[PDB]
Amino acid sequence: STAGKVIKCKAAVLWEEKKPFSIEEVEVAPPKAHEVRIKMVATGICRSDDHVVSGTLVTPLPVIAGHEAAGIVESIGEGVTTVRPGDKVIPLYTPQCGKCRVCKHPEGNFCLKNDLSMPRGTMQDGTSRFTCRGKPIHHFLGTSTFSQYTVVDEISVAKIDAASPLEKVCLIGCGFSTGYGSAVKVAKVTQGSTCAVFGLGGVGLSVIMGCKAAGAARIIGVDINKDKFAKAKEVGATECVNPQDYKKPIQEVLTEMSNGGVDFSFEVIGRLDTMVTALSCCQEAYGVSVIVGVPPDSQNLSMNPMLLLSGRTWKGAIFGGFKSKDSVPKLVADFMAKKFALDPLITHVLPFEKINEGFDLLRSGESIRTILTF
Amino acid sequence: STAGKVIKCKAAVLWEEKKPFSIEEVEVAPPKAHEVRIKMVATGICRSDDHVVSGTLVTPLPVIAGHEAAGIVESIGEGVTTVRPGDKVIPLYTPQCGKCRVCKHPEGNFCLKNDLSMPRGTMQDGTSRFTCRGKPIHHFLGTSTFSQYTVVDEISVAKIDAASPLEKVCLIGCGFSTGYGSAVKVAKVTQGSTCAVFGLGGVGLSVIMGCKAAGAARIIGVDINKDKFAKAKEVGATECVNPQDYKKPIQEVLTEMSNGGVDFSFEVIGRLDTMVTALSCCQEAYGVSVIVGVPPDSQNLSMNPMLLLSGRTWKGAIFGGFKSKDSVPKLVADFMAKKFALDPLITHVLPFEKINEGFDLLRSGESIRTILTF
Numbered sequence A, B: 001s002t003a004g005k006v007i008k009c010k011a012a013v014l015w016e017e018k019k020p021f022s023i024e025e026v027e028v029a030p031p032k033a034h035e036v037r038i039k040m041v042a043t044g045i046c047r048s049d050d051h052v053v054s055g056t057l058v059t060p061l062p063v064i065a066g067h068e069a070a071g072i073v074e075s076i077g078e079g080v081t082t083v084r085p086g087d088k089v090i091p092l093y094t095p096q097c098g099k100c101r102v103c104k105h106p107e108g109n110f111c112l113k114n115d116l117s118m119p120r121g122t123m124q125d126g127t128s129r130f131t132c133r134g135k136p137i138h139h140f141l142g143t144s145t146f147s148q149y150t151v152v153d154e155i156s157v158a159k160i161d162a163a164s165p166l167e168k169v170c171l172i173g174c175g176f177s178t179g180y181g182s183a184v185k186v187a188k189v190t191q192g193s194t195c196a197v198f199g200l201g202g203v204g205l206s207v208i209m210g211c212k213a214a215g216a217a218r219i220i221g222v223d224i225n226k227d228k229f230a231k232a233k234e235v236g237a238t239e240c241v242n243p244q245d246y247k248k249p250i251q252e253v254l255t256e257m258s259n260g261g262v263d264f265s266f267e268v269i270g271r272l273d274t275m276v277t278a279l280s281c282c283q284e285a286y287g288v289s290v291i292v293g294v295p296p297d298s299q300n301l302s303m304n305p306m307l308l309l310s311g312r313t314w315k316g317a318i319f320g321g322f323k324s325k326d327s328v329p330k331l332v333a334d335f336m337a338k339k340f341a342l343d344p345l346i347t348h349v350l351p352f353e354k355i356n357e358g359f360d361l362l363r364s365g366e367s368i369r370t371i372l373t374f
């Protein structure tokens, strides 16, 4: 009934930076070979989407943003073998082509087909499937989930359990998996260790969940918004500290609290200064610090390399280090078996048409994750 | 005829920066409780010693430098249990107290009793055993090996094989162990991998030795002095490149040669720009870069944190990550079992009285390691 045809539907178009999204009609082309067109069911509001609005994260405009979502396949293009119409699916903003040197590496997950390093805002073939007012619109990280329908390349979608609650497991498309994996896969937090988590939004709360799952003895949450502390403690923090409360830099405070520095630290905000602070507060000889937050475009941090020469390890990761298409269905299955919880992250629910109120909630500090329903 | 008495002997005193060493008589006090007085037999000239002369490395002056050495115990103070008069020993510029959180950690080696982070230039008790022309002289990293006799704390000395050739195994006191361990212990180079080594002096050649022992398939040496390339290939480099030969930045050159970035890179020079270059030339999703070189005092580097967010790991280490008193006797035993070679590092052997000529050889680019014999 819609297969092979252009679909007219509503989407949230961003025409320029620092402006509200425009809810209006777009035209969605049918999928070409090895492409999948998806009817969206739920999408979360992640800070990275707000980074597109603010210019923190540069990608070509005008654009349909959104990358944390779940939906149901409407149709598939020629040659698609891994999903079928009617399947529940999660779009993958980090693809898994399975053929490049990173996909073949046992640890790597930043597939070389990604649209992050040199953003084009297109499908893999360099073209767009979206038109609005007769104008071509860019894609975002090959997903573009702020739309009733999107088209993604096959390497950018994973089939998930047919009984999955899509208004919850959309968070496995970004925020939960990023935070959880950053702790259990990237840092490899050890039982009995002391952890420090900078930033207690959706992703930082998920880092805390991973630290707790790994058996950390102490998990210190750090945020300048003390309203975030209650939920952080609910999901596993053993203390929370507000840097604004202290007359000393918080790296000094955390070093004292940990009797010489923490075992594992995580930057989950997106500021150059807290990236250096988080590295400094881990123990100088054997500490590990993981960058998760997204820095402002093209800006360099400044740091003393003696912080590394003493023995520290510094690393970062996209999507918690998970190979995306392998890991997303397994994470959904684990959620179905109650191995981790997603309800603590969901503070607000709104219809898709109220997307701008959802971003207002994020910017005011009141929300963790708002889930939008189509 | 010297136990319990002050010893008058020859040492090389550095009275101020950017001056030749002054070879003259000093007074060496007898060892106090848990101290060891050593008759030096051989000491190598390491670039870190030259860093003290040049002001790159700040430590209190005037000083008896030298930290890469081997000798024979002349006497021990009360309470010493790990060495005896007559023992062959190697001083440890990174102590191993066995009691701090770092010594008890399975990975850490930067013992909290070190004199590197906040240099005092004294014994552990805060005083000096050296006098010259009436004046107290500072120690260097708890070793001070540019002297016919030195006094060290028990936690800064290791007993080694009584049959050890000290004119060779003095290099296990710094240069060899640092480079070798940086490859095999800190980076954990894997079989079949591609490595890039920036800097082909004594430490860089030992990094190559470790990469080869770990089974690397490709080892690219990088140096602006092409005279270093012959020896680098002899000990395992498969290719050598001189950045001055290229119009493009060498991180771009190395990324092309490795078809997308190397598995492991090592900065073994001590320049801020080459630490950032070495990080950039390793593969963005799974590469590992190790800082070995000593940066100029109090200078910060500048880098883009997206280099880490994509998946790179950045780390540094002192003394190759080796727990010093545990590892040095085992490395000596490994050398005696012919498991690695030290002669490729030794280009010059001079009497101690020619220390300044040995430093001229290093600064001119002509030497790798000069061994000074007492």
Ligand SMILES: NC(=O)C1=CN([C@@H]2O[C@H](COP(=O)(O)OP(=O)(O)OC[C@H]3O[C@@H](n4cnc5c(N)ncnc54)[C@H](O)[C@@H]3O)[C@@H](O)[C@H]2O)C=CC1
Pocket (backbone or CB within 6 Å): A046, A047, A048, A051, A174, A175, A178, A198, A199, A200, A201, A202, A203, A204, A222, A223, A224, A225, A228, A243, A268, A269, A270, A271, A274, A291, A292, A293, A294, A295, A317, A318, A319, A320, A368, B309
């Ligand atoms: N590496 C990856 O793959 C991913 C990176 N991100 C990035 O992670 C970061 C966090 O994302 P969300 O949790 O959704 O954002 P969020 O905005 O909900 O949480 C950020 C938290 O940091 C706090 N904060 C802000 N400035 C602070 C400061 N100077 N000191 C201490 N705390 C401060 C805020 O009060 C807030 O609670 C963002 O930068 C996001 O773009 C998000 C998902 C994937």
Ligand SMILES: NC(=O)C1=CN([C@@H]2O[C@H](COP(=O)(O)OP(=O)(O)OC[C@H]3O[C@@H](n4cnc5c(N)ncnc54)[C@H](O)[C@@H]3O)[C@@H](O)[C@H]2O)C=CC1
Pocket (backbone or CB within 6 Å): A309, B046, B047, B048, B051, B174, B175, B178, B198, B199, B200, B201, B202, B203, B204, B222, B223, B224, B225, B228, B243, B268, B269, B270, B271, B274, B291, B292, B293, B294, B295, B317, B318, B319, B320, B368
């Ligand atoms: N982390 C640790 O525990 C230790 C650190 N070090 C430091 O390692 C570094 C190397 O030590 P050595 O091998 O003894 O010194 P070295 O002076 O013999 O070797 C340094 C090499 O770097 C080359 N080089 C200089 N500038 C260069 C540039 N822009 N690009 C490419 N190559 C360049 C030089 O030609 C030279 O061959 C020093 O900074 C030393 O202080 C030394 C031992 C222990």
Ligand SMILES: O=CNC1CCCCC1
Pocket (backbone or CB within 6 Å): A046, A048, A049, A057, A067, A093, A116, A174, A294, A318, A319
């Ligand atoms: O939040 C989802 N994706 C992010 C990952 C880090 C770079 C910016 C985009």
Ligand SMILES: O=CNC1CCCCC1
Pocket (backbone or CB within 6 Å): B046, B048, B049, B057, B067, B093, B116, B174, B294, B318, B319
């Ligand atoms: O070369 C020997 N020791 C070095 C170790 C790194 C800091 C300067 C001193």
Ligand SMILES: [Zn+2]
Pocket (backbone or CB within 6 Å): A046, A047, A048, A049, A067, A068, A174, A175
């Ligand atoms: Zn996200």
Ligand SMILES: [Zn+2]
Pocket (backbone or CB within 6 Å): A095, A096, A097, A098, A099, A100, A101, A102, A103, A111, A112, A113
């Ligand atoms: Zn791939």
Ligand SMILES: [Zn+2]
Pocket (backbone or CB within 6 Å): B046, B047, B048, B049, B067, B068, B174, B175
């Ligand atoms: Zn040295």
Ligand SMILES: [Zn+2]
Pocket (backbone or CB within 6 Å): B095, B096, B097, B098, B099, B100, B101, B102, B103, B111, B112, B113
């Ligand atoms: Zn110790």
